[PDB]
Amino acid sequence: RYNFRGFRWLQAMIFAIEEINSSPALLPNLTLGYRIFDTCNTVSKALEATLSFVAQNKIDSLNLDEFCNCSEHIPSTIAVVGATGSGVSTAVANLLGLFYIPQVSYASSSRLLSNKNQFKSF
């Protein structure tokens, strides 16, 4: 199915980023980019997107006794905006707080995400 409200939210994020870039007072001489994916209200899609986000930290993983390298020009995401559902946000929060990447949600409101022992960067 197609969600027009979700596309409006995506447009809101893009609009905010562009307005930050145009303004000369907030972060002079610095530009903000973005990499925005669709979750389809499903954990699997959001987890694929999160793996894309943390590929660099996968390169920086410690468990692997043998090194692995990816494309150098792959950007390292500083912070993530999302997501809507609480289960999606829980899974994404696990993966992101594995690497201490801030994640600011806009519609997840479950109390289980108020635990800073499990969700450090949420």
Ligand X SMILES: O=C(O)[C@@H]1Cc2c([nH]c3ccccc23)CN1
Q: Is 64 annotated as a binding residue?
A: no
Is residue 94 close enough to count as binding ligand X by CB under 6 A? no
The rounded distance, in Å, linking the Cα atoms of 104 and 83 is 8
Distance of CA 110 to the CA centre of its chain: 18
Is residue 27 close enough to count as binding Ca ion by CB under 5 A? yes
> Closest distance between ligand X and the C-beta of residue 5, in Å?
7
Q: How far from each other are the two terminal CA atoms of the chain, in whole angstroms?
A: 29
Residues within window 60-89 making contact with ligand X, judged by CB under 6 A: 84-86
> Please, which residues bridge with residue 81 across strands?
104
> Closest distance between ligand X and the C-beta of residue 39, in Å?
12
Distance of CA 15 to the CA centre of its chain: 17
**x-or-dash pattern for a second copy, window 43-82, by CB under 8 A?**
xx--xxx-xx--x--x--xxxx-xxxxxx-xx--------
Sign of CA dihedral 58, 64, 65, 69: negative
Q: Is 47 annotated as a binding residue?
A: no
Binding-site residues sit at 5-9, 20, 23, 26-27, 39, 84, 86, 107, 109
